[PDB]
């Protein structure tokens, strides 16, 4: 199982790296949608 551990660990640690980036990814994807909404609200100010 040292061989199966070798494989499992690399499987997992690589995913951990994905998680390690995705945390930041979600924030900026959130930013994009929240800001997209904000733009629309300033457009309303322009409609006024």
Short mmCIF file of C-alpha atoms in Angstrom, two decimals:
data_model
loop_
_atom_site.label_atom_id
_atom_site.label_comp_id
_atom_site.label_asym_id
_atom_site.label_seq_id
_atom_site.Cartn_x
_atom_site.Cartn_y
_atom_site.Cartn_z
CA UNK A 1 0.00 0.00 0.00
CA UNK A 2 2.94 2.25 -0.06
CA UNK A 3 2.33 2.25 -3.80
CA UNK A 4 -1.32 2.82 -3.43
CA UNK A 5 -0.57 5.56 -0.89
CA UNK A 6 1.87 7.10 -3.29
CA UNK A 7 -0.85 7.26 -5.88
CA UNK A 8 -3.60 8.34 -3.54
CA UNK A 9 -1.58 11.08 -2.02
CA UNK A 10 -0.74 12.61 -5.33
CA UNK A 11 -4.36 12.39 -6.35
CA UNK A 12 -5.41 14.23 -3.22
CA UNK A 13 -2.72 16.77 -2.96
CA UNK A 14 -3.31 17.83 -6.51
CA UNK A 15 -6.92 18.37 -5.75
CA UNK A 16 -5.97 20.30 -2.68
CA UNK A 17 -4.12 22.62 -5.01
CA UNK A 18 -7.26 23.10 -6.96
CA UNK A 19 -9.10 23.98 -3.76
CA UNK A 20 -6.17 26.24 -2.91
CA UNK A 21 -6.93 28.39 -5.92
CA UNK A 22 -10.69 27.96 -6.16
CA UNK A 23 -11.16 29.82 -2.95
CA UNK A 24 -9.85 32.94 -4.73
CA UNK A 25 -11.59 32.07 -7.91
CA UNK A 26 -14.96 32.12 -6.26
CA UNK A 27 -14.33 35.52 -4.86
CA UNK A 28 -13.59 37.08 -8.09
CA UNK A 29 -16.35 35.27 -9.91
CA UNK A 30 -18.63 36.65 -7.20
CA UNK A 31 -17.15 40.06 -7.80
CA UNK A 32 -17.98 39.87 -11.38
CA UNK A 33 -21.60 39.16 -10.78
CA UNK A 34 -22.06 41.51 -7.95
CA UNK A 35 -20.37 44.28 -9.88
CA UNK A 36 -22.39 43.42 -12.98
CA UNK A 37 -25.45 44.15 -10.86
CA UNK A 38 -23.94 47.37 -9.55
CA UNK A 39 -23.46 48.62 -13.06
CA UNK A 40 -27.08 48.02 -13.73
CA UNK A 41 -28.01 50.08 -10.68
CA UNK A 42 -25.97 53.03 -11.81
CA UNK A 43 -27.72 52.67 -15.13
CA UNK A 44 -30.92 53.14 -13.19
CA UNK A 45 -29.46 56.32 -11.74
CA UNK A 46 -28.87 57.40 -15.33
CA UNK A 47 -32.50 56.47 -16.19
CA UNK A 48 -33.61 58.80 -13.42
#
